[PDB]
Design a protein around this ligand. Structure first.
Ligand SMILES: O[C@@H]1[C@@H](O)[C@H](O)OC[C@H]1O
Length: 310
């Protein structure tokens, strides 16, 4: 049986979740006898490219990529394919690429859950939509799900959208700036903020808190960062979407190994990336509110009750 090396290329380690993605996946893939190389581009596209090429040069059998920019990797991926390398897209889809497979959560469903919980908290009023990174395919999918829910209420005029901004590279500080400016331009007449992840909600909430609005404006999130959990506890963030990282990382590990033995995979979705429909496996997300923090995140050991409350 051939030895297997997996090349893992990741965006950055700024969002709390990616550390756990990387560590959990390495541990698992190593349990299955693979050697994992891992490299972080720290948000630089050209750097990502170079790192993927470094790994191709080290003759990895499988590439596991978390793209910074899902539109800039087409070429380097086709060069991998010429060399017989299997390519698995991790969490964020890569567009116009010769991908073998894609593993992620139902990201459209995530969006919808976010909006569902916010129009529950604030059924009428002024709404600000805070998109994710404009070069992450997931940011568009979150929005797409958000809208499915939000649209019927826009069209009945029960809701009014008073801003719509995407936050470059998911940075919390760019989210703060955007929210700071939004509040100003609206004279603080915003009722709800559909923010697409925890790091950016948190950005926005510091802006809200500067105006005495934290706790009074409904805001969404995802990843269940420890900080976001405590905010939900304190009444500052309405909700977050929990995405069990262990289950995703474990499945990607299993899939990496299967692609290396050329096994027939079992997809449960197919996603058109512009070049082709990519076989995909999507996990189900979980809504976390103040009531079920104990049913979900502490129950799974994602965060300990000591971390959350003490
Ligand atoms: O950056 C996003 C991250 O916060 C979310 O958890 O997973 C999808 C990514 O696009």
């Amino acid at each position: 049986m051939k030895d297997l090396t997996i090349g893992m290329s990741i965006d950055d380690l700024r969002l709390e979740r990616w550390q756990k993605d990387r560590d959990i996946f390495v541990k698992k893939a190593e349990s299955l006898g693979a050697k994992v190389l891992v490299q972080s581009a720290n948000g630089d596209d050209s750097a990502q490219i170079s790192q993927i090429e470094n790994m191709l040069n080290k003759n990895v059998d499988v590439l596991v990529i978390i793209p910074h920019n899902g539109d800039v990797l087409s070429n380097v991926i086709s060069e991998a394919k010429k060399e017989g390398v299997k390519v698995l897209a991790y969490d964020r889809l890569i567009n116009n690429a010769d991908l073998d497979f894609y593993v992620s959560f139902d990201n459209e469903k995530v969006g919808e859950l976010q909006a569902d919980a916010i129009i529950k908290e604030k059924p009428e009023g002024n709404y600000f939509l805070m998109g994710g990174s404009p070069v992450d395919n997931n940011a568009k999918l979150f929005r797409k799900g958000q809208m499915k829910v939000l649209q019927p209420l826009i069209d009945s005029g029960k809701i009014k959208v008073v801003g719509d901004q995407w936050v470059d590279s998911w940075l919390a500080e760019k989210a703060l700036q955007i929210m700071e400016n939004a509040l100003t331009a609206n004279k603080n007449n915003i009722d709800a903020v559909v923010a697409s992840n925890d790091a950016t909600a948190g950005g926005a909430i510091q802006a809200l808190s500067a105006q005495g609005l934290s706790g009074k404006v409904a805001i969404s999130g995802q990843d269940a960062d420890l900080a976001a959990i405590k905010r939900i506890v304190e009444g500052t963030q309405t909700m977050t979407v929990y995405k069990p990282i262990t289950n995703l990382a474990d499945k990607a590990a299993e899939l990496s190994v299967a692609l290396g033995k050329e096994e027939k995979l079992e997809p449960n979705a197919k996603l058109n990336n512009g070049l082709k429909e990519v076989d995909a496996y999507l996990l189900d997300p979980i809504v976390v509110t103040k009531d079920n923090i104990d049913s979900t995140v502490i129950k799974d050991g994602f965060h300990s009750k000591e971390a959350v409350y003490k």
